[PDB]
Amino acid sequence: TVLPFEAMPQHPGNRWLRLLQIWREQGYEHLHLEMHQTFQELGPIFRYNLGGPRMVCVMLPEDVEKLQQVDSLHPCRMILEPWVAYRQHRGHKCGVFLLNGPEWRFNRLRLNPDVLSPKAVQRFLPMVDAVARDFSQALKKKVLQNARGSLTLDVQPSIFHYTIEASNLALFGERLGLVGHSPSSASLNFLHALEVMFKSTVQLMFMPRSLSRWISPKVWKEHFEAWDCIFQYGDNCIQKIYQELAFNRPQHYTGIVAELLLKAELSLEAIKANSMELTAGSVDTTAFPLLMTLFELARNPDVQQILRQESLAAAASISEHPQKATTELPLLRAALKETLRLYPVGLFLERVVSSDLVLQNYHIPAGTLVQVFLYSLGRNAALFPRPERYNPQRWLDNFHHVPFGFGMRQCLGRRLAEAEMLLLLHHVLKHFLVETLTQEDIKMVYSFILRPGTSPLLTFRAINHHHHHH
């Protein structure tokens, strides 16, 4: 006795009122708070009167599980129009982020061994580790200059450059000295273009191209300029590795995009496509969780001390083999789960479902956009007693951690992001105390990704008073 779809509670909003609001305010920064309010009012599930087709909103781990079982051989998420529009506009391919069906599987099966797999991690992680080391050392050099052995800064810029750097090293095998040196104009341009892309994504996202073409011509013009810039940044990288490997096939490991070029299992343009997604994808999605993690430790000193204690003890064996940072810092790994529980950069998981299923005892038809809202999911008091508490212990005691998604589609950059975040935190922790007066909740803001709206003024205080030694 399952309830018919038509009998599911309904988000009260006109698709058109949202759209005009996006037109007026040039964005939709509270999306997540609204959604959250909506589950709060209506409960675990609801449907949204969309532009015609059925779409449903869920927030329970149970629902993710079922969603995973219904994953075909080709799971589907929605065609993000403005992004694809650009690719077809310049005649490019699309990486796994923008693909569906046979083309997606083909690519993903050829990217898993070299981006995601555990044998890939083990080659690229010591490279990340070196970048992570330079971050702290450089931050320590600046810290010890100060009479008080501390520095108080907005760490956002430098975190964003750490991830431009750690990533570009792992990906391409070049250091672009953006750690312990000022931003370049090339890196500042890139960052800005990525911001413009997301903002202009949100403006064009909520309406068909046929209509947005004539009511927002210059949003489109903005979006393509931003991409043109993101693409110039990423094609410059491609050109350099590509010419280099034309003349010398290395004996040793020189990064992820080198494996893909060597192994030649993918066409040049298919590699170009997937390189871009990795260069663009590796920056913001990693930086905000680091930032938010830095904030949570800063304002939970007792948890900070615990994570340090663990990192101080594993110090010696991690500088011996940096690869042991995965298995030896499980509290730190847990802290990340916790940061992403509260601050889920990917706001929601998306499936355009290909077979009737049952969620929450309602019946879901073939082609329903099911959408899993990870903000409300993370804050469910029933599943996460005291959700407002940052308590990484919570995780040590299943589908509760799913911020990278699930199944075969699960984030290709998961382990790179994980390594990058984990390793930076490890070195910061053994070297510095992290502090703030700014102990009130940071207001998160939606522009395609869920990001902090402000940056807290953080303090890094040296524990030792030495440049190398913790």
Ligand X SMILES: N#Cc1ccc([C@H]2CCCc3cncn32)cc1
Q: What are the residues binding ligand HEM (CB under 6 A)?
A: 77, 95-97, 108, 277-278, 281-282, 285-286, 289, 340, 345-346, 349-350, 403-406, 409-413, 416-417
Q: Which residue among 1, 4, 119, 214 contacts a second copy (CB under 8 A)? A: 214
Q: Which residue among 78, 109, 215, 268 contacts a second copy (CB under 8 A)? A: 215
Question: Cα(439)–Cα(296) distance, rounded to whole angstroms?
Answer: 9
Closest approach, Cβ 208 to a second copy, in A, equals: 11
Edge-to-edge strand list for the sheet holding 458-462: 150-153, 458-462, 432-435
Instruction: Indicate the residue among 15 and 141 with the shorter CB distance to a second copy.
Output: 15
Instruction: Indicate the residue among 24 and 386 with the shorter CB distance to a second copy.
Output: 24
Identify what 464 binds: a second copy, ligand X, ligand HEM, none; CB under 5 to 8 Å per kind: none
Q: Determine if 346 is a binding residue for ligand X (CB under 6 A).
A: yes
Q: For residue 183, what are its two tokens?
A: 């931003």
In this structure, are residues 292 and 299 in contact, taking their beta carbons and an 8 Å threshold? Answer: no
Instruction: Indicate the residue among 272 and 333 with the shorter CB distance to ligand X.
Output: 272
Q: Determine if 211 is a binding residue for a second copy (CB under 8 A).
A: yes
Interacting residues with ligand X between 433 and 462 (CB under 6 A): 449
Q: In terms of Cα–Cα distance, which of 433, 448, 469, 458 is closest to 31?
A: 448
In this structure, are residues 409 and 164 in contact, taking their beta carbons and an 8 Å threshold? Answer: no
Task: Please tell me whether 94 is known to bind a ligand.
Answer: no
Q: Which residue among 285, 300, 339, 376 contacts ligand X (CB under 6 A)? A: 285
Identify what 224 binds: a second copy, ligand X, ligand HEM, none; CB under 5 to 8 Å per kind: none
Question: Cα(75)–Cα(408) distance, rounded to whole angstroms?
Answer: 8
Q: Determine if 79 is a binding residue for a second copy (CB under 8 A).
A: no
- Residue tagged 């949202």 (tokens): 18
Question: Cα(144)–Cα(464) distance, rounded to whole angstroms?
Answer: 10
Element (H, E) at 369: strand 369-373
Closest approach, Cβ 465 to ligand HEM, in A, equals: 33
Residue 48: DSSP 8-state: E
SS3 call for 383: coil
Question: Cα(376)–Cα(379) distance, rounded to whole angstroms?
Answer: 5
Q: In terms of Cα–Cα distance, which of 410, 462, 403 is closest to 435?
A: 462
Which among 13-21, 41-49, 95-103, 283-291 is the span making contact with a second copy, rule CB under 8 A?
13-21
Q: Determine if 411 is a binding residue for ligand X (CB under 6 A).
A: yes
Q: In terms of Cα–Cα distance, which of 60, 100, 24 is closest to 409?
A: 100
Closest approach, Cβ 93 to ligand HEM, in A, equals: 13
Q: Which residue among 14, 37, 317, 361 contacts a second copy (CB under 8 A)? A: 14
Question: Cα(451)–Cα(284) distance, rounded to whole angstroms?
Answer: 9
Q: Which residue among 2, 10, 13, 16 contacts a second copy (CB under 8 A)? A: 16
Buried/exposed 184-208: b ≥16 CB within 10 Å, e otherwise:
eeebeebbebbebbbbbbbbbbbbe
Q: Determine if 413 is a binding residue for ligand X (CB under 6 A).
A: yes
Q: Determine if 358 is a binding residue for a second copy (CB under 8 A).
A: no
Which among 20-28, 196-204, 268-276, 384-392 is the span making contact with a second copy, rule CB under 8 A?
20-28
Q: Tell how far CA 171 is from the center of its chain.
A: 16
CA angle centred on 341, ends 339 and 342, rounded to 5° = 70
Phi-psi category of 27—alpha, beta or left, where left has phi over 0 and alpha has psi -120 to 50? left
Which among 16-24, 45-53, 280-288, 324-332 is the span making contact with ligand X, rule CB under 6 A?
280-288
Q: Determine if 17 is a binding residue for a second copy (CB under 8 A).
A: yes
In this structure, are residues 452 and 284 in contact, taking their beta carbons and an 8 Å threshold? Answer: no
Closest approach, Cβ 405 to ligand X, in A, equals: 8
**How do beta strands 55-58 and 45-48 pair?**
antiparallel
Q: Determine if 201 is a binding residue for ligand X (CB under 6 A).
A: no
Instruction: Indicate the residue among 179 and 219 with the shorter CB distance to ligand HEM.
Output: 179
Q: For residue 86, what are its two tokens?
A: 């650009």
Task: Please tell me whether 411 is known to bind a ligand.
Answer: yes
Q: Which residues bind a second copy (CB under 8 A)?
A: 14, 16-17, 20, 23-24, 51, 211, 214-215
Per the annotation, binding residues are 348, 411
Per the annotation, binding residues for heme are 411
Q: Which residues bind ligand X (CB under 6 A)?
A: 97, 276-277, 280-281, 285, 346, 411, 413, 449
Per the annotation, binding residues for 21-hydroxyprogesterone are 348
